[model samples]
Target: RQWALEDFEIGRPLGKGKFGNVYLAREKQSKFILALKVLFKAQLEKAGVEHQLRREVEIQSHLRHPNILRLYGYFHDATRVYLILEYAPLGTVYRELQKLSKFDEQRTATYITELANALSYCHSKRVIHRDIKPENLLLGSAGELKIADFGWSVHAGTLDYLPPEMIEGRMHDEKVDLWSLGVLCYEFLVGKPPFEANTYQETYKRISRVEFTFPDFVTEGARDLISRLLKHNPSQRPMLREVLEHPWITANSSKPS
Candidate 1:
């Protein structure tokens, strides 16, 4: 059966978000701290989802990386499903960014490197993480970075990036992760995304149009990577393997401890 809200310890705090609730829960008197995700079946049924839930569970179960959060296990019942997850005590990296106003160069570099490693590993296994925003980054008690949330990730090994004609609905692969990493890197350096608009539609238009500009303080190396990652022609963008081997990440790798 899916673990219900009542099954968790009330005092232990977990982060809150728009879609679902995460809880720091304990089981079997072991004093474990698991990120317990609860979702109702009725809500999903009303949404007419095709295979998103199944995909999430399947992908998360298979993914194994130090920079990626671990999925302990999961269960389902008549009304819902419960995902037992690795609890990151530091909460979301997005909130940390808001707290710091902007991350220092070393901090940003460290997080970026860790994220890149995770993305590279995922790509090697034919995993495509579609959404790679800061909100999905988590930090543990050891101050280690981890990528969380496999909800939007897909399995598409053969696909690369979108072609010119199929920009809107094209199936893509690992390069999508690189595109997102580019967006996150821009935000890390400049405090926000390069092409932000008031609405999602406007944002999509900007992305489709491929309008990107770097701030003055951004390093030439950083800018170079961003330009390559955000290329409108996904064919023009470098693969995850290529990015890891690039001079930017390799030459100046002074990440946080």
Candidate 2:
């Protein structure tokens, strides 16, 4: 279980960020590709995880599931922090979503099912991930979805993905994960957040009120699927396991394999 920067060969740059940059890497001996997301210590420390950062990394490193982009290990330097994450060669779902504009039914269905399975695993661990946005999703070499980030792993999220509870200071309801997923589901199909409007405050107002309508073609069945997740009452949202059993997945064919 030993990992070190010396064990890998530096390759191309992957993504550039405000604080740090991601680099493509190949393990010198094992021939495995990886993403080394090295970010500044100063910025992260200010986010308030510095005291428990090592422990946070330890727990995330041990996390295992097909749809989770593994946080295999880390190595910290005086100025920066290196997080060795599982590489997804296909790149960010945000970029892909922008390119495609909107996903076809099969792709959206497949992505939702895969996410439901992954979130069920994480929620069972008593984990509630923040910022489960398109920006944090990655597609593997085989086109499978992987959650590249999770709880305590990133900065604040886009306002459009915020559920009513989050907007109203309800303080991290576990079911909000499903609410985030529902927002993602809507955006994946409709190419925009449900409550997005001309003004940012207007969007905020729409979310706090839960005032949004489905596209004309979302189908009564799909409407049922989304409305349940975006429900005003947190406890009323379907459990991740139950979401997998929904008619959207069961009545149709949306298998990742």
Candidate 3:
């Protein structure tokens, strides 16, 4: 009676992610718009990956925040998995291909403010958003960034975003996201990750040594926050609340972007 591929009227295709395609759809009877994310079983099977967990689904579904996308529910068949998600019309702003996508101070800091608040809320619920990268975040109709995806395996150890401890085989936890926040900060203005290198080996050493110089354009206040977040010692990273209180965020966060 429900949750079938035919239950909704399909519209234009939205975009494609690594594992799936998203399409705008409307419920046949209620006429409510939603984005259906489709992931094929054979593709995951070929990758030797397990399908999304029930617990993972529960976590994403339970999270409710202005800056977090809502996962209404999901359904699956022999061929694929379909996730019903809130449609984010504005999509993401990370696609600057060649124009050098540098967000201004107010824009960057305001995004950090929204991100920090949502991250803290998730932490309070004991949910660690292991995946905290730019592409996973979506901008809403009002220009608010909503974390679009909750969990994905690649984010667990991706070279540019991985915390040093994770690469060293040392124990790590929620603080890993703080490391990514620092990377996100630089990438916002610099158009690329701070520690990115031509080779994975080089990237590893750069990350381990915390080696990277900000471009001349980066502000002192911005440098201070990035420095704190990218501490080699995860425990040294500031808590989300303290991060919000940092001088950089205080100076630029409240302004309208």
Candidate 4:
């Protein structure tokens, strides 16, 4: 059911974003706390965001997983759309990282493990989350992690996160997410993206040319894992399942958990 602004209480807050807002509200009859994603059609149309809006609904509806935020339902009023989704009060993992000056390897590993688990599960179901950055990774209040933001996700072989060949309109597969995981893992370790290009063109060039170098601050195991993930040859990149059970995480005996 579509919720009107009048239906929600004044004190309740919603998540903020560039295109829309997410509100916490109680359904009139069911009385469950629903995370209502409110989007103004006019705003979306003006910003040329219709495709993104539609994709979010289409993709999130069919994707059901414990580690992924579930979309219960969606509807629209005369001028807007409402997506009822799972609400997590802890906010995005990106926000959490911001509150901390930095995270140690063990702390980072725990979150990374959860993310790998979720991505591996998604891949098994033929779903690829193209946008696997920190902002879209949500954390429940109880410490469970959930991947959010379905707009950038697709069933499989999406062009958005594809390897160089695929982006050039060649063959593609789920390994693209592995590349993203590599980028994300590097970011989590260093607190910034691997390719430090100032512009989009520079970023693409750095990615395609594989120009960046790892710093000495990063551990050897971390470097090995990242290199495997960011391998220029898409065929060489390890799958998420392999990443989850990699020796870097489970085999390291000296690392304190």
Per-residue CA lDDT of model 4 for 199-232, tens digit only, reads: 7666667777666687678888888888898878
Question: How high is the CA lDDT of each candidate model?
Answer: 0.71, 0.79, 0.81, 0.71
What TM-score would candidate 3 get against the native?
Answer: 0.91
lDDT of 1 at 5: 48
Model number with the top lDDT: 3
- Winner of 2 and 3 under TM-score: 3
Evaluate model 3: give its lDDT. 0.81
Poorest stretch of ten by lDDT in candidate 1 = 157-166
User: For candidate 2, lDDT tens digit of each residue in 227-257?
Assistant: 9988888889998877888877666536742
Which consecutive 10 residues in model 2 have the weakest lDDT in total? 149-158
Candidate 3 ranges beyond 4 A from true positions: 51-53, 96-100, 152-158, 255-257
Query: What would the C-alpha RMSD of candidate 1 be, to one decimal place?
Result: 4.2
Candidate 3 at residue 140, lDDT?
A: 85
Between candidates 3 and 4, which one is better according to lDDT? Answer: 3
